[PDB]
Design a binder for this molecule. Structure first.
Ligand SMILES: Nc1ncnc2c1ncn2[C@@H]1O[C@H](COP(=O)(O)O)[C@@H](OP(=O)(O)O)[C@H]1O
Length: 256
């Protein structure tokens, strides 16, 4: 066993289901996953240390294993594509995407939770979204998939960026995971019996080697109720950006 630079990276999107994807992929015997978000290419304190530092953060892997890490920030970080390209132009990238409006709500809910833990006030999402639609709200920008995808496609062939349907992963993960295995040239080792639905959790959980487990409590939070009129501004806001994205990647998703 040795440390190797990652042959694939889960690059985002933030709140798209990056942890679920990593854990599920790690069920494969030929996959070695970094346990934590590495934040190599996006944090200057990390990137300035060089690829040698990145290598030290990698899991140890056997000769027939792929090494993977997930850092959700990469996708929406302008500087990151060029840096990854510098490390490895032929790398295979995984991008997991959810409905952009739902992703916005997921993003808000996490930041709300962060504030609650610190006993700090945080405004209802309506306050952040409206001002007309508030275009200064950073979570909106992270859902502009077309805009960010353009930066990546300058450096990487579309064929080397596999898009995981995050909505479908939540509903029925196995078929999505099968496509990831194929994309990565992995043998189809994962099976439907590796997944079981937990009604208490409200999400699918993982079964392997006799051990059963659901994702961390921070994964799968209830979203707030939103003024319907505001939700409609939200859906409308993304309607055209979605069209542009569908044409860019040659694929449509069942989004609002
Ligand atoms: N099996 C699973 N268990 C829990 N959450 C899952 C899941 N599969 C997908 N997810 C999604 O992963 C999201 C978090 O993504 P990330 O790890 O990138 O932050 C969750 O967002 P929500 O908490 O809004 O429901 C949830 O929707």
């Amino acid at each position: 066993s040795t440390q190797q630079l990652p042959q694939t990276i889960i690059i985002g999107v933030r709140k798209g289901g990056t942890r679920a994807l990593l854990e599920m992929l790690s069920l494969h015997p030929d996959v070695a996953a970094a346990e934590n978000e590495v934040h190599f290419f996006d944090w200057e304190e990390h990137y300035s240390q060089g690829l040698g530092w990145y290598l030290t953060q990698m899991p140890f892997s056997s000769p027939h294993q792929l090494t993977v890490e997930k850092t959700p920030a990469y996708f929406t970080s302008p500087k990151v594509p060029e840096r990854i390209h510098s490390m490895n132009p032929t790398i295979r990238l995984l991008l997991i995407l959810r409905d952009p409006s739902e992703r916005v709500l997921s993003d808000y809910t996490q930041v709300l939770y962060n504030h609650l833990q610190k006993h700090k006030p945080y405004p209802p999402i309506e306050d952040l979204l409206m001002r007309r639609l508030n275009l200064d709200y950073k979570a909106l920008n992270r859902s502009l998939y077309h805009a960010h995808m353009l930066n990546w496609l300058r450096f990487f062939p579309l064929g080397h960026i596999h898009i995981v349907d995050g909505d479908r992963l939540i509903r029925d993960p196995f078929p999505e995971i099968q496509k990831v295995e194929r994309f990565l040239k992995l043998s189809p080792q994962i099976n439907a019996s590796n997944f079981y639905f937990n009604k208490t959790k409200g999400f699918y959980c993982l079964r392997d080697s006799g051990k059963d487990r659901c994702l961390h409590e921070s994964k799968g939070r209830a979203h707030p109720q939103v003024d319907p009129k505001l939700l409609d501004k939200l859906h409308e806001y993304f309607h055209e950006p979605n069209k542009k994205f569908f044409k860019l990647v040659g694929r449509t998703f069942d989004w609002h």
